[PDB]
């Protein structure tokens, strides 16, 4: 059920991508300034400089389709959220907290731009806990409980 409140708001998001995942990496760069330098790529911009750059935009773009994949397999999803686990353990080495974080911001996104009312944000918060369960599973097969 928690899948499917998500999804009867996620219809804003999927409408554009580049914006929305800009808003949301932008607002994470903001609230959870220590999370920049996690991105590389992206460290030491400025935040003045976040809301209006193409490439943060074009990444927020990747992570929400890919939440999006998640979404609609609705709980069902191995072969999409492995992957995902093992690349951010291993090659992006992101400790698992930040991802409670991300989802928090996307929450907060999605009150404001896509009508998530209270009901839905305690569904997405249930929602990402599953896919965050699942990911800290396989952080600690690869040898990741930081
Ligand atoms: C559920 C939330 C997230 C999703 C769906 C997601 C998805 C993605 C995807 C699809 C990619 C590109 C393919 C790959 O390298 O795996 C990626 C790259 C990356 N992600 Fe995430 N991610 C999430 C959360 C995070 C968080 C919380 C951080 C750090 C705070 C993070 C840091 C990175 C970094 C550093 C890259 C590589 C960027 C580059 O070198 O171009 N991700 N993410």
């Known amino acids: 059920a928690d899948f499917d409140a ?3 708001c996620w219809g804003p998001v999927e409408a554009d ?4 995942g800009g808003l949301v990496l932008t607002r994470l760069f903001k609230e959870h300034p220590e999370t920049q330098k996690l991105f ?4 030491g911009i400025a935040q ?3 809301a209006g750059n ?3 935009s074009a990444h927020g773009a ?3 389709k890919k939440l999006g994949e998640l979404l609609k397999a609705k709980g069902s999803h191995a072969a999409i959220l492995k992957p995902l686990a093992n690349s951010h353990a291993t090659k992006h080495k992101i ?6 974080l991300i ?12 009508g998530l009312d209270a009901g839905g944000q305690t569904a997405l918060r249930n929602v990402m806990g599953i896919i965050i369960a699942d990911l800290e599973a396989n952080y600690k097969e690869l040898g990741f409980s930081g």
């Open 40 to 43: 590389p790529k992206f460290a």
């Open 103 to 114: 989802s928090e911001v996307l929450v907060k996104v999605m009150q404001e731009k896509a």
């Open 48 to 50: 003045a400089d976040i």
């Open 62 to 64: 990747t992570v929400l």
């Open 17 to 20: 991508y580049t914006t929305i």
């Open 54 to 56: 193409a490439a943060v």
């Open 6 to 8: 998500v999804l009867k």
């Open 95 to 100: 400790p698992i907290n930040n991802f409670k």
